[PDB]
C-alpha cells in the first residue's frame, strides 16, 4: 500500500525584466508501476504530446538524455485507437532517453491495471502514475510550458 510510493518534487523558475525571479515548487505522490523499476530518478520534464509520441522513426534526432517524460492520458472514449499501448508509450519514451516516465491516469484509470501487469519484464527505468490531486499538481506546473525539473524518490 505505502510500498511503491513515488515522491515527486517539481521546480520551475519564472524570471522578469527586473531580474526578480519566482520559483514554483510542488511536492506530490504517485506510485511506481510494476511496468518499470523502483529507482530514484531526476531530470528536466518533457511533456510528451500525442503525434510526437506516435513518431515511429529510429533516428538520433529523437533521442535526448536524462529527461522525465510526462504523459497525460485521454479519456478512452475520446482516444479509442491509440498509436501505442500505455506500456508501449513508456517503452518508447525510454528508447528516446527518458530517465523516468510519469503518466497522469486521471482520465484513464484502466491504465493503472495495464501498467501494473507484472507478466512482462520491467523496464529499466521508473514508470510512475499519478491521479487525483497529485496529478492536478503535476499538470498545473507542466501546463506553464516552461522548463521544469523533477526528482522522483522511493521512500
Amino acid at each position: 500500500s505505502t510500498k511503491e510510493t513515488a515522491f515527486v518534487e517539481v521546480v520551475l523558475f519564472e524570471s522578469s525584466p527586473s531580474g526578480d525571479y519566482t520559483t514554483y515548487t510542488t511536492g506530490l505522490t504517485g506510485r511506481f508501476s510494476r511496468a518499470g523499476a523502483t529507482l530514484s530518478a531526476e531530470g528536466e520534464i518533457v511533456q510528451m504530446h500525442p503525434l510526437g509520441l506516435c513518431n515511429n522513426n529510429d533516428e538520433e534526432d529523437l533521442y535526448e538524455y536524462g529527461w522525465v517524460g510526462v504523459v497525460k492520458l485521454e479519456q478512452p472514449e475520446l482516444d479509442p485507437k491509440p498509436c501505442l499501448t500505455v506500456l508501449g508509450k513508456a517503452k518508447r519514451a525510454v528508447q528516446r532517453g527518458a530517465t523516468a516516465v510519469i503518466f497522469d491516469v486521471s482520465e484513464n484509470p484502466e491504465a493503472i491495471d495495464q501498467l501494473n501487469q507484472g507478466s512482462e519484464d520491467p523496464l529499466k527505468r521508473p514508470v510512475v502514475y499519478v491521479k487525483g490531486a497529485d496529478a492536478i499538481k503535476l499538470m498545473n506546473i507542466v501546463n506553464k510550458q516552461k522548463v521544469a525539473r523533477a526528482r522522483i524518490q522511493h521512500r
Partner: protein
Amino acid sequence: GCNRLNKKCNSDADCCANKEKCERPIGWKFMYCRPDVGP
C-alpha cells in the same frame, strides 16, 4: 533571448551569462542552471 533555467550544465559557461549560474540543488544529483541575482 537567453533562458537556460533548469537546463543541465557542467559550468557557468553552459548557462546564460551573468543572470544565471550552474549549481547542484541540495539533495539532487545533477547541476542545473538557476537564476543569479548577484552578490
